[PDB]
Design a protein around this ligand. Structure first.
Ligand SMILES: Cc1cc2nc3c(=O)[nH]c(=O)nc-3n(C[C@H](O)[C@H](O)[C@H](O)COP(=O)(O)OP(=O)(O)OC[C@H]3O[C@@H](n4cnc5c(N)ncnc54)[C@H](O)[C@@H]3O)c2cc1C
Ligand SMILES: Nc1ccccc1C(=O)C[C@H](N)C(=O)O
Length: 455
């Protein structure tokens, strides 16, 4: 049987472990953290994530989608909150098939671990990779105390996240050609209890947003009607707007409460544990990292966040990472040798990772605006008529990304054509009735070939 060692029993690494093990491979998976299925007296984990069609499809191929969705809350649309003003759903799509799902991250990881073991993978926890000797084909791991132990490997998969040690180790033998692009927002996890959720009548089946321009909060629902909230806020005030809010001014929980009472006056009273959460949850950093090189011959490959860290504003990191896992397993299963598989996987996935990294960055401005332009509104209206006239040609970029499996680069390219056609058609008009609709439709059929078999 073909042998593989995967570093990182997170979301992509556990999926790819199940796909390879079930297809005959002898799989060993090493994870730095303890096994989250071993119950302890520690506090419960509250991070959740949006699962969309790309990740759900990956799970479906793995036979795990039904299990994960039984523990997921449907989000039918965005619920945008701006003070005093009543929220109204902006639905994601036309019916409940076009929804995204809110799932507890720890639960998803526990379901994936059970899936990898059921397929025959061996998982070893409390061992973090420290280094790799590619010439000798040996790995060095240690527990939290740092005491080193070595393991031989044959094929190494780095599914070890944004600060991947496999990627770091690859720098010793290849030029990674890395481009690290910092992003100025940090983030902080907060919580709305089930009682406050109900008191303030927050719709459970929606993604909630409190836009505020250069900062914003989002909230995703849990099965118990609590919401996990994330504040995105600059670490530091930029040189030009030097008094503007940032994490550096929020020196403690009390300061954070004042900031929320001033800037998010409607959300603040929903957040009972703000002061505590602010002080005990560390502030997270965001970044986009692009790498020229994702593999070393047939010996080692990166996927998921180890290959392509991205900013979180599209909710697609996990979805892309599970899509990567499926592609990697497909290439490894059927290729002439591991070197061929890994080069082909990389060539396939790199243009798509670049496109979703860019679209993620672009998604911030959308989400964080308190008010949409009249121009933007009219473009959206016209787009809705086009989608109705030509649903296999005009499919909004958001939907191509979230509700289909169209390669991300293609979704980006078609989104660009759509953006230009709407922009030119709406210019110098203030309403639909002044727009030549057939002429727009003619540009749609001229410029956008039909796609079948999308949903
Ligand atoms: C604030 C925020 C919100 C997000 N929201 C969404 C969302 O709504 N939807 C979505 O699709 N994505 C979202 N993401 C992105 C998602 O969290 C990641 O893209 C996804 O977890 C990547 O999966 P992965 O398997 O590559 O990495 P991970 O799931 O991070 O797993 C790597 C695993 O590596 C283990 N490990 C790390 N280093 C070592 C080592 N040296 N040795 C052994 N093990 C190691 C880590 O402990 C771990 O278990 C969000 C990200 C952030 C930061
Ligand atoms: N779901 C998320 C979870 C966390 C961070 C962002 C998102 C998103 O906003 C993606 C979704 N389609 C959205 O754009 O509304």
């Amino acid at each position: 049987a073909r042998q593989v060692t995967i570093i990182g029993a997170g979301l992509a690494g556990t999926l790819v472990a199940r796909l390879l093990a079930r297809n005959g491979w002898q799989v060993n998976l090493f994870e730095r953290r303890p096994d989250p299925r071993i119950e302890t007296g520690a506090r419960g984990r509250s991070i959740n994530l949006a699962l969309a069609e790309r990740g759900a499809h990956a799970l479906r191929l793995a036979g795990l989608e039904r299990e994960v969705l039984a523990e997921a809350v449907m989000m039918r649309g965005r619920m945008v909150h701006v003070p005093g003003t009543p929220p109204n759903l902006q639905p994601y799509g036309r019916d409940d098939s076009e929804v995204i799902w809110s799932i507890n991250r720890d639960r998803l990881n526990r379901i994936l671990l059970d899936g990898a073991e059921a397929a025959g993978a061996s998982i070893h926890f409390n061992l973090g990779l420290d280094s790799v000797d590619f010439a000798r084909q040996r790995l060095t791991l240690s527990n939290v105390s740092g005491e080193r132990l070595e393991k031989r490997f044959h094929l190494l998969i780095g599914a070890d996240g944004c600060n991947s040690a496999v990627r770091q180790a690859m720098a010793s033998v290849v030029d990674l050609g890395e481009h690290l692009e910092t992003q100025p927002h940090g983030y902080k996890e907060l919580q709305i209890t089930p009682e406050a959720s109900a008191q303030f009548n927050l719709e459970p089946n929606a993604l909630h947003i409190w836009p505020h321009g250069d900062y914003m909060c989002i909230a995703l629902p849990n099965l118990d009607r609590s919401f996990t909230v994330t504040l995105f806020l600059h670490h530091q005030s930029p040189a030009a707007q030097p008094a503007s809010p940032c994490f550096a001014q929020l020196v403690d929980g009390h300061a954070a409460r004042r900031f929320f009472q001033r800037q998010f006056p409607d959300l603040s009273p929903m957040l009972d544990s703000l002061e505590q959460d602010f002080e005990h949850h560390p502030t997270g950093k965001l970044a986009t990292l692009r790498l020229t090189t994702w593999h070393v011959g047939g010996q080692a490959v990166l996927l998921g966040d180890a290959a392509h860290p991205m900013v979180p504003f599209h909710g697609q990191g996990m979805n892309c990472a599970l899509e990567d896992a499926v592609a990697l397993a497909e290439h490894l299963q059927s290729a002439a040798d591991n070197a061929s598989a890994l080069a082909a996987f990389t060539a396939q996935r790199q243009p798509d990772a670049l496109a979703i990294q860019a679209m993620a960055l672009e998604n911030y401005v959308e989400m964080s605006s308190k008010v949409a332009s009249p121009t933007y509104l009219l473009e959206r209206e016209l787009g809705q008529i086009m989608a109705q006239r030509q649903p296999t040609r005009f499919i909004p970029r958001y939907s191509m990304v979230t509700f289909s499996r169209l390669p991300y680069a293609q979704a980006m390219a078609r989104g660009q054509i759509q953006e230009q056609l709407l922009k030119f058609a709406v210019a110098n008009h203030s309403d639909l009735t002044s727009i030549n609709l057939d002429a727009v439709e003619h540009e749609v059929t001229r410029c956008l070939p039909p796609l079948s078999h999308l949903c």
